Design a protein around this ligand. Structure first.
Ligand SMILES: C/C=C(/C)C(=O)O[C@H]1C(C)=C2[C@H]([C@@H]1OC(=O)CCCCCCC)[C@@](C)(OC(C)=O)C[C@H](OC(=O)CCC)[C@@]1(O)[C@H]2OC(=O)[C@@]1(C)O
Ligand SMILES: Nc1ncnc2c1ncn2[C@@H]1O[C@H](COP(=O)(O)O)[C@H]2OC3(O[C@H]21)C([N+](=O)[O-])=CC([N+](=O)[O-])C=C3[N+](=O)[O-]
Ligand code: ALF
Ligand SMILES: [Mg+2]
Ligand code: NA
Length: 994
């Protein structure tokens, strides 16, 4: 039944045609069960390992490196006894890392906890219904419950489904709906309709939502909806079909790899417009199946020059190191990519309770009467420090510590708070902290009493376990609680009947201690207590009292206030009817006002600062809470989101208000407002979504189940360490420290990290540029294969794969957190750098093709065969006359390559010392800063030698160690690159902007 909250109890009964007195018939159940399904939440298992593997091959740069790897296995058959020693070494290494690294990725996806599973832990196994079947209440499996069912719930029960309340059996039904609001305070239910058909959960006080639990009372209800049609079901849906978007840096790569798909597929057809000459004149040397081998080889040579392999491992390494680094900062990163994404965060959406606050209701102010005289009435006001439930803090009078016991009024105030209370405090030995037991509102009173210690009880030598309720127990020993007149909606107050300890049931001196909403209690007072005396409540005293209550209730503090009173002459126990609550107000009459307490869930100490830092870094912070707007705004003012006196009419909304705004205005609202209150789970994800429609990298921070949809939706979900499993399972990070400040440092780490990736991502793609220039030249120019597709791989994995993971250690700026969020669209290479890396690209390209032709022509061992024939190496038999000087079968020897790869290596080792800074002269910025880079080159070079000396290696790479002569030239064809970019960095540092 949709909108069951808007209808009457009769209307809901009628709707399913069910009897509140008998319940559904076995037939009705059978039918409804068929129509509506089982009251359960669909489980959503993570994709099987098979999926996890297939997905690793969805990347274009991978499908290209695989498609080419196949063409390398196709043309791998053609290999006789001349080079049969290394026929299948490439088709092996090309698919080696292609799955070796592609499999390590599955070690970053199959590693995840399911959130819906965590969410299903709120599904109670059993439920209680009245079926026409039998007369007594049946306890059946919850999943067996269906709409129209007549369900029963009592204190302690976890609500089985979304239920419309029919009848409340106790004086009140108190509920904890924190899975939907994040607020633990008890909500008071009623059975009357709630007209507004757009009422938010907080407003449907006539409904019971699946997953919440009964704090007090007993009630009968009719099921409105089950399964995914419940409020917990909507949370469930927003976590199911969602799938996190792709990191900003990831899109940058997807763009690159997509353009690399057009460039390479164009370079090959570019050689076609250059091979329009050996097809005209009559000439053949083999079938097309033996002649077309040229094209399907220049492709398998570019696929290794273009696709910058090794990056997929340099990145994963940088992140892994960052993760461990942040982990020491108390930030558990569950998603490696998000690390980079947190760096460019512009907006931080934050839950309030338990996230911005401590979620420990605390009495921070209280007052009693000082003196009365005619129209004059002064109050003794006090303040209490401490923001946790721990009995640690002090009472201040004008900011100066005092002893509560000095004031008799505080002795009575403490007595009332200790007796008129159903809660207590406990010390959790395992966790080492104090925790409430019962209502937060009451435990604040319990804690207050301990801080006050009005009888000066000795507590410093008590174990923390025994310190928890020491002062309360003392007071409990002075008065015996006969019975308590529980809270009533028409009274807004509560009381307890007490008799002096060690007295007869007939003895005099019995008291009633009252606690409640100030207006009602104060109106039922005819006296005011002054110390241990009492005087008539007069107009002036009442006005003084109410005026301060008004202040404390709505300001920069906005506190929940309670008036405390006692009836000095209560009725005789006998003349009191306890089974009739409508008579309680009259018993709580002719009262003596005693005092007032004001409480609030206090902000965490390091939050106002964390937000100012965020501000400095250009990050805005928005609050989205399920709690009320009044306390929402007050907390915003306390932590710096709103000015202490700033006008917030248009800067703060409730979910209901927000829902009234038309779509376009809701959007704008998220850009203007900074405080959203009394919202629902879906409101949070919606606000985050709107924020993302303005192209903003938004983070969501919280601890509740109601925060899950937003945490999932945000680019960076951050859960509190002591928060719910659900919140944690939906986040990218967890602040095990619960410190908001840990978020600021995580951002810094994310900025520092990206800046260093920004370098090796370039250093690497840059290298892949020079490589393509080489293969392009030795393809349209005619020259032979200077570098084979089996060498490049080792170069872009070990040769460069080290200096890259070395730049990732470059010392970060000092003003990294004094600059605004970098744009999500900020490209890596463009402008003068696109041009700079363009020249350095061709350079290395012609520095390898020429370094090979050199060894042949103008060199040594190589025959001076001039260019006019050097390119006719494919004609050492078909045309001997115009080509015949030395041995023919010497081309594919370790000379042209062993002299072309020595350049790429020497050059790149130079490029690294250059990537140490975008626009900075190496002479200015000591190229020896990043010590690791130095050691990184010393390793890549010794590995370039080790791949020569130990024959077993150069046997496949086909390279022969040059002696102390040839190498002397190599260091002269690469060394000049240090001067080329050196001028480029001068043109950018002077004749350009920075
Ligand atoms: C891997 C190797 C190469 C050579 C490649 O094809 O890179 C191109 C390419 C795809 C881009 C280009 C390369 O394009 C050229 O250099 C022009 C063509 C020259 C042909 C010469 C004949 C042989 C990058 C590399 O280089 C220069 C020096 O201009 C810069 C940048 O890339 C980045 O910012 C890196 C993103 C990870 C991209 O324009 C990029 O395309 C994009 O979408 C970008 C925005 O990404
Ligand atoms: N329909 C209603 N309209 C307004 N207030 C209500 C309503 N129903 C209940 N309340 C009161 O509003 C509170 C929930 O919302 P916040 O604190 O965030 O504004 C409830 O807290 C107490 O009475 C409730 C209470 N109790 O439910 O048992 C007991 C109390 N006591 O005696 O200790 C005091 C209450 N109190 O508000 O002061
Ligand atoms: F703790 Al909240 F909205 F402030 F769930
Ligand atoms: Mg919370
Ligand atoms: Na997220």
């Amino acid at each position: 039944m949709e909108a069951a909250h808007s209808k009457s109890t009769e209307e809901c009964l009628a709707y399913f045609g069910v009897s509140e007195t008998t319940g559904l018939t076995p037939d009705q159940v059978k039918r409804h069960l068929e129509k509506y399904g089982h009251n359960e939440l669909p489980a959503e298992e993570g994709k099987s390992l098979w999926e996890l593997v297939i997905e690793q091959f969805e990347d274009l740069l991978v499908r290209i490196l695989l498609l080419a790897a196949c063409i390398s296995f196709v043309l791998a058959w053609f290999e006789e006894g001349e080079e049969t020693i290394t026929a299948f070494v490439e088709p092996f290494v090309i698919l080696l890392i292609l799955i070796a690294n592609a499999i390590v990725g599955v070690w970053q996806e199959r590693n995840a906890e399911n959130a819906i599973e965590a969410l299903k832990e709120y599904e109670p196994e059993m439920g209680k219904v009245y079926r026409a079947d039998r007369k007594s209440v049946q306890r059946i499996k919850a999943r067996d419950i269906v709409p129209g069912d007549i369900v029963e719930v009592a204190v302690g029960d976890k609500v089985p489904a979304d239920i419309r309340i029919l009848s409340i059996k106790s004086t009140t039904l108190r509920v904890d709906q924190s899975i939907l609001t994040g607020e633990s305070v008890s909500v008071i239910k009623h059975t009357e309709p709630v007209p507004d058909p757009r009422a938010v959960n907080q407003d449907k006080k006539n409904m019971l939502f699946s997953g919440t639990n009964i704090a007090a009372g007993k009630a009968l209800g009719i099921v409105a909806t089950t399964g995914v049609s419940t409020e917990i079901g909507k949370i469930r849906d927003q976590m199911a079909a969602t799938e996190q978007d792709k990191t900003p840096l990831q899109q940058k790569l997807d763009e690159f790899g997509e353009q690399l798909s057009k460039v390479i597929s164009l370079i090959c057809v570019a050689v076609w417009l250059i091979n329009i000459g050996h097809f005209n004149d009559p000439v053949h040397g083999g079938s097309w199946i033996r002649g077309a081998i040229y094209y399907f080889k220049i492709a398998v040579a570019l696929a290794v020059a273009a696709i910058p392999e090794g990056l997929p491992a340099v990145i994963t390494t940088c992140l892994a190191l960052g993760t461990r680094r942040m982990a020491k900062k108390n930030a558990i990163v569950r998603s490696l990519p998000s690390v980079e994404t947190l760096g460019c965060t512009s907006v931080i959406c934050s839950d309030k309770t338990g996230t911005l606050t401590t979620n420990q209701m605390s009495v921070c102010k209280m007052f009693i009467i000082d003196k009365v005289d005619g129209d004059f009435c002064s109050l003794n006001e006090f303040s209490i420090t401490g923001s946790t439930y721990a009995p640690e803090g002090e009472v201040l009078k004008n900011d100066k510590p005092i002893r509560s016991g000095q004031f008799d009024g505080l002795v009575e105030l403490a007595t009332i708070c200790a007796l008129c209370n159903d809660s207590s405090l406990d010390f959790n030995e395992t966790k080492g902290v104090y925790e409430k037991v019962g209502e937060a509102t009451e435990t604040a009173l319990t804690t207050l009493v301990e801080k006050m210690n009005v009888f000066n009880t000795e507590v410093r030598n008590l174990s923390k376990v025994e310190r928890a309720n020491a002062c309360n127990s003392v007071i409990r020993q002075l008065m015996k609680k006969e019975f308590t007149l529980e809270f009533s909606r028409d009274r807004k107050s509560m009381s307890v009947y007490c008799s002096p300890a060690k007295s007869s049931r007939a003895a005099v001196g019995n008291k009633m201690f009252v606690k409640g909403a100030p207006e009602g209690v104060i109106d039922r007072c005819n006296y005011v207590r002054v110390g241990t005396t009492r005087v008539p409540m007069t107009g002036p005293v009442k006005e003084k009292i109410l005026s301060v209550i008004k202040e404390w209730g709505t300001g920069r503090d906005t506190l929940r206030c309670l008036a405390l009173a006692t009836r000095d002459t209560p009725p005789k126990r006998e003349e009191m009817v306890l089974d009739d609550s409508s008579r309680f107000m009259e018993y709580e009459t002719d009262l003596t006002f005693v005092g007032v307490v004001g409480m609030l869930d206090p902000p965490r100490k390091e939050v106002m600062g964390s937000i100012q830092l965020c501000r400095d870094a250009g990050i805005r912070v928005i609050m989205i809470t399920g709690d009320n707007k009044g306390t929402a705004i007050a907390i915003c003012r306390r932590i710096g989101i709103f000015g202490e006196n700033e006008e917030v009419a248009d800067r703060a909304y409730t979910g209901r208000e927000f829902d009234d705004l038309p779509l376009a205005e809701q959007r704008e609202a998220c850009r203007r407002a900074c405080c959203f209150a009394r919202v629902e789970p879906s409101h949070k994800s919606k606000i985050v979504e709107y924020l993302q429609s303005y192209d903003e990298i938004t983070a969501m921070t919280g601890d509740g189940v109601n925060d899950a949809p937003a945490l999932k939706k945000a680019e960076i979900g951050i859960a509190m360490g002591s928060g719910t499993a659900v919140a944690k399972t939906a986040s990218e990070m967890v602040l095990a420290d619960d410190n908001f400040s840990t978020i600021v440092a995580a951002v810094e780490e994310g900025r520092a990290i990206y800046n260093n990736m920004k370098q090796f991502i370039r250093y690497l793609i840059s290298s892949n540029v020079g490589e393509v220039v080489c293969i392009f030249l030795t393809a349209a120019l005619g020259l032979p294969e200077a570098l084979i597709p089996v060498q490049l791989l080792w170069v872009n994995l070990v040769t460069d794969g080290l200096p890259a993971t070395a730049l990732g250690f470059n010392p970060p700026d000092l003003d990294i957190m004094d600059r605004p969020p970098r744009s999500p669209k900020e490209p890596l290479i463009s402008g003068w750098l696109f041009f700079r890396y363009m020249a350095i690209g061709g350079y290395v390209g012609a520095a390898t093709v020429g370094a090979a032709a050199w060894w042949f022509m103008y060199a040594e061992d190589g025959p001076g065969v001039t260019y006019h024939q050097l390119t006719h190496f494919m004609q050492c038999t078909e045309d001997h006359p115009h080509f015949e000087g030395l041995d023919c079968e010497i081309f594919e020897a370790p000379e042209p390559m062993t002299m072309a790869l020595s350049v790429l290596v020497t050059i790149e080792m130079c490029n690294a010392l250059n990537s140490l800074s975008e626009n900075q002269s190496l002479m200015r910025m000591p190229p020896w800063v990043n010590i690791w880079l130095l050691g990184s080159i010393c390793l890549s070079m010794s590995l370039h030698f080790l791949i020569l000396y130990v024959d077993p290696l150069p046997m496949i790479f086909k390279l022969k160690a040059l002696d102390l002569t040839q190498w002397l030239m190599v260091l002269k064809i690469s060394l000049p690159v240090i001067g080329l970019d050196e001028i480029l960095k001068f043109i950018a540092r002077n004749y350009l902007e920075g």
